[PDB]
Design a protein around this ligand. Structure first.
Ligand SMILES: *[C@@H]1O[C@H](CO)[C@@H](O)[C@H](O)[C@H]1NC(C)=O
Lengths: 417, 219, 216, 145
């Protein structure tokens, strides 16, 4: 649960470049032999993605900002990658989405999970039947308030170590739209020494997850190794295999999706990357002929908003009204018409010079930005017990017999000691 | 589920002799890395089992250097360089790792000594026991070696096997002998219905069992 | 020094449940595996399962699958075992082990616990003296005995002269028969001791707090 | 729902947000209890002058008028032809016809056209196909794929 790894060491977030990764089907609509333009959360091409790896003295399980979406890519031999943890706090304080492949099936659950320092899954003591099936469940300590659960088809996961180059490539897309989560998957074999292969790929939906929970951070789970021969302290003395995974960020960019005869995407264009890409996007074609074309219009954005209103002087004497030598009786309350002047309400409402202040129908802050038609002030003095009678739909010696406020009264009430 | 068989059931060894205990497994417990998964446990009298060897090739911390195991495949053997008097107990084999753990049949150890015949003594039930309504003919067999011994009850020349219980003592700390007693449970009517009662001690050292008898009317 | 403590023994009726505790001392319960074992006089040792307090996963012997559940308490550093739907066959001595370092190279055992599953109720022992039989049997040395029968539960200790006489004294372990225990004792003394000198056997039953003194 | 929700002089189980620091976003549920600060004086997370508790209780009573009586409100939101059909109205379906001009209603999509076996291969997750014009081109049968 909370036991820290012995050999884990922190490393700076190194970055690497992605050629064309981040391309996925925006929806389930089918299109073939056409070039479609769409704008959605995409990973810009030739962008920078975090460079992380897992070895026996650097173990990478960092926390990264989910933002509006992220992209995943990793090269594997034994498929060290286990899953991910998603949530705003990744603790029981709120709900967290988790995806775990525990050697039998993909499990997706929405509950209140207890956060762990180094959550992960592993196996131990394989011996003479390779197995590699989930042994311990350190992902979370407990769960409660479960609102969603999903199970995929059973399958056998091969975690056996292999030599040579990286034979597997797994890429996933994590995104959030109005709380509706979309997950995309893609898997191909590769022959890679380091970094990522040079090519193109198209990711496809894996599951639909209409959950609706805010996620601002996430973690990457890794699978470690254990044996009868060289174990360690629980669970600090456990080690994991060699693997590398990369994490990107999705932005609302527009791509030109080139669909083949079978509907599979064979090429993509990121408009913002290259002025040639902008030319293609404007022409809505994947080929640009020699010449000069108009793509868009450049403009200079304002530095800041500047407001220069006229002088608010010539204010009517509200201060004199509230500080006048004498006031009229409650039954003889004076009705005074205020017009042909400006009102500065900042000094009145926000000075905290009055015992009580309330408004009916409109908040005091909004009134400062509104222009009225007629304004009236009724000044009177009443006893403390009678102050509560000054409100819409009231009764009593003052509300009924002296001064009554209509139920639709949109004004404010001011009183002080 | 794995099955183990152990042989021999028991074996004697003097102070300084070598003891050999072997275990068998129905499945291979060795893996690619070449090491073996097994543990050896010893349960001394009045004490719980304690680990002796782990992995068959490495001695457990605090264990005497005389204990060491060896073998390959599913057939192993435990080697004790010089057996001491403290080694009395039952040896066990254990399969670890990640699998339903299985235990062995057990192997008892003892110290060899000059053979001695049992001392047969038979006592009749007490008068108080007869007053209570019960009866128990008790026969004592003490100071005999090896532990292999048997007793047959005869009532008026007729053998009776029912109601017979036997208990074997742990190896003595001074003479290294063994003691056993046979109790014949009988009701008051059954006891008083017969007079002659006999207890014959069958032992390897003597072809003719040692026989002691008494008469109810004489007691 | 690592050591495990368990309750001395328990007595329960068929169909009920028994809870056992194996305390941890000298080591942290969180980071070390846990084990349980069953010992019978005829079948020797029999395995129960293993539990990791950190993880909580448990595997049980196909014999007892579904018959028991294993739990552990991290704060109390004590491991708990529970058995349900008990029967006569469950009578045996239980042992607990752990402290593995995620390795087989280290494990420890407690003194164990004896659990008896029967519907009988505590019965004080009946102690009777065993005098020599017919005078036709004679020897240079005389033998005496003490009879204990119809008693349970164990343990029941029998000695001679309050343990002051350790010469020729043999203690015979009890035998279970029809939910009853029976043990006997014997002492060999020369002809100059008995009947010239008194010989007595003391029997103690801590469960029933019964102490008896019978002269031969 | 005056006969059910109204309880004596009020019902605390129904509450509303009277104040907020800005304008709400559609389909946004804010349960924060942060005190709304009307003035320049920090509220320090407690009520006071120019500091009001946004969460408030209704004035539901059995004797309230038509405008003041509680009215349970239910809003239905949905997406049309934007994903595989998980729901459908109680409309009886009929047998499929091919090589004929018919009026088809498949997964809520209504139109007229000729239905024929398609040589195009769609991906397992894809359901609706579109032509160059972006109009309806092909569709999977919801019952027998
Ligand atoms: C994997 O996770 C599922 C999630 O419910 C769980 O039920 C299962 O026991 C776990 N292990 C295996 C081997 O499936």
């Amino acid at each position: 649960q909370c036991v820290n790894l012995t050999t884990r060491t922190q490393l700076p977030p190194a970055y690497t470049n992605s050629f064309t990764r981040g391309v996925y089907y925006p929806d389930k609509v089918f299109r073939s032999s056409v070039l479609h333009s769409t704008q959605d959360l995409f990973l810009p091409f030739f962008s920078n993605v975090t460079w992380f790896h897992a070895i026996h003295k650097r173990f990478d399980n960092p926390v990264l900002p989910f933002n509006d979406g992220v992209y995943f890519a990793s090269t594997e031999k034994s498929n060290i990658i286990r899953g991910w943890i998603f949530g705003t706090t990744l603790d029981s304080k709120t709900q967290s989405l988790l995806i775990v492949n525990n050697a039998t099936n993909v499990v997706i659950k929405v509950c209140e999970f207890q956060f762990c320092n180094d959550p992960f899954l592993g196996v131990y003591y394989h011996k003479n039947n390779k197995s590699w099936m989930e042994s311990e469940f350190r992902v979370y300590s407990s769960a409660n308030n479960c609102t969603f659960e999903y199970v995929s088809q059973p399958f056998l996961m091969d975690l056996e170590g292999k030599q040579g180059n990286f034979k597997n490539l797994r890429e996933f897309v994590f995104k959030n739209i109005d709380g509706y989560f979309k997950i995309y998957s893609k898997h191909t074999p590769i022959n890679l020494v380091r970094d990522l292969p040079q090519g193109f790929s198209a990711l496809e939906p894996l599951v639909d997850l209409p959950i609706g929970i805010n996620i601002t951070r996430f973690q990457t789970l890794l699978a470690l190794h254990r044996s009868y021969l060289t174990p360690g302290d629980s669970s600090s003395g456990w080690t994991a295999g060699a693997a590398a995974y990369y994490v990107g960020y999705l932005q609302p960019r527009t791509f030109l999706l080139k669909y083949n005869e079978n509907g599979t995407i064979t090429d993509a264009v990121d408009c913002a990357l290259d002025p040639l890409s902008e030319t293609k996007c404007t022409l809505k074609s994947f080929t640009v002929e020699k010449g000069i074309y108009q793509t868009s219009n450049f403009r200079v954005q304002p530095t800041e908003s500047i407001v220069r209103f006229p002088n608010i002087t010539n204010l009517c004497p509200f201060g004199e009204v509230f500080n006048a030598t004498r006031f009229a009786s409650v039954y003889a309350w004076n009705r005074k018409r205020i017009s042909n002047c400006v009102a500065d309400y900042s000094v009145l409402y926000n000075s905290a010079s009055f015992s009580t202040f309330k408004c009916y129908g409109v908040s005091p802050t909004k009134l400062n930005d509104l222009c009225f038609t007629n304004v009236y002030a009724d000044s009177f003095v009443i006893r403390g017990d009678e102050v509560r009678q000054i409100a819409p739909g009231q009764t009593g010696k003052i509300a009924d017999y002296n001064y009554k406020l209509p139920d639709d009264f949109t004004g404010c009430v001011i009183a002080w000691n | 589920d794995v099955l183990m068989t152990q042989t021999p059931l028991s074996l004697p060894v003097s102070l300084g002799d070598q003891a050999s205990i072997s275990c068998r497994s129905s499945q291979s417990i060795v893996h690619s890395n070449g090491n073996t998964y097994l543990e050896w446990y010893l349960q001394k009298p009045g004490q719980s089992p304690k680990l002796l060897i782990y992995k068959v090739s490495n001695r457990f911390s605090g264990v005497p250097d005389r204990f060491s195991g060896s073998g390959s495949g599913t057939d192993f053997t435990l080697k004790i360089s010089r057996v001491e008097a403290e080694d009395l107990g039952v040896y066990y084999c254990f399969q670890g790792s990640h699998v339903p753990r299985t235990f062995g049949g057990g192997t008892k150890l003892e110290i060899k000594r000059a053979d001695a015949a049992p001392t047969v003594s038979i006592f009749p039930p007490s008068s108080e026991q007869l007053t209570s309504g019960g009866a128990s003919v008790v026969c004592f067999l003490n100071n005999f070696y090896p532990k292999d011994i048997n007793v047959k009850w005869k009532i008026d020349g007729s053998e009776r096997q029912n109601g017979v219980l036997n208990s074997w003592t742990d190896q003595d700390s001074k003479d290294s002998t063994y003691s056993m007693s046979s109790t014949l449970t009988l009701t008051k009517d059954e006891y008083e219905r017969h007079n002659s009662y006999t207890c014959e001690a069958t032992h390897k050292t003597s072809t003719s069992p040692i026989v002691k008898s008494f008469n109810r009317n004489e007691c | 020094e690592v050591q495990l403590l368990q309750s001395g023994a328990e007595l329960v009726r068929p169909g009920a449940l028994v809870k056992l505790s194996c305390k941890a001392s000298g080591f942290n319960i969180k980071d070390y595996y846990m084990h349980w074992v069953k010992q019978r006089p005829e079948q020797g040792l029999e395995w129960f399962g293993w539990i990791d307090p950190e993880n909580g996963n448990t595997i049980y012997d196909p014999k007892f699958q579904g018959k028991a559940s294993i739990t552990a308490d991290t704060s109390s550093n004590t491991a708990y075992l529970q058995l349900s739907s008990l029967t006569s066959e469950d009578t045996a001595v239980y042992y607990c082990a752990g402290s593995g370092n995620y390795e087989d190279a280290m494990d420890y055992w407690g003194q164990g616990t004896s659990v008896t599953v029967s519907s009988a109720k505590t019965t004080p022992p009946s102690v009777y003296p065993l005098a020599p039989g017919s005078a036709a049997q004679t020897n240079s040395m005389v033998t005496l005995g003490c009879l204990v029968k119809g008693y349970f539960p164990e343990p029941v200790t029998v000695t001679w002269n309050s343990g002051s006489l350790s010469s020729g004294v043999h203690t015979f372990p009890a035998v279970l028969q029809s939910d009853l225990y029976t043990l006997s004792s014997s002492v060999t003394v020369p002809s100059s001791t008995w009947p010239s000198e008194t010989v007595t056997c003391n029997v103690a039953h801590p469960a029933s707090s019964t102490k008896v003194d019978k002269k031969i | 729902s005056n006969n059910l929700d109204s309880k004596v002089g009020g019902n605390y189980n129904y509450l509303y947000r009277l104040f907020r620091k800005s304008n709400l976003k559609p389909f946004e549920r804010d349960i924060s209890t942060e005190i709304y600060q009307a003035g320049s004086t920090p509220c320090n997370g407690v009520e006071g002058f120019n500091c009001y508790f946004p969460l408030q209780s209704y004035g539901f009573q059995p004797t309230n008028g038509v405008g003041y009586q509680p009215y349970r409100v239910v809003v239905l939101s949905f997406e049309l032809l934007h994903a595989p059909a998980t729901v459908c109205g109680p409309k009886k379906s009929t047998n499929l016809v091919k090589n004929k001009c018919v009026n088809f209603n498949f997964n809520g999509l209504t139109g007229t056209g000729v239905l024929t076996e398609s040589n195009k291969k769609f991906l397992p997750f894809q359901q609706f196909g579109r032509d160059i014009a972006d109009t309806t081109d092909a569709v999977r049968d919801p019952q027998t794929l």
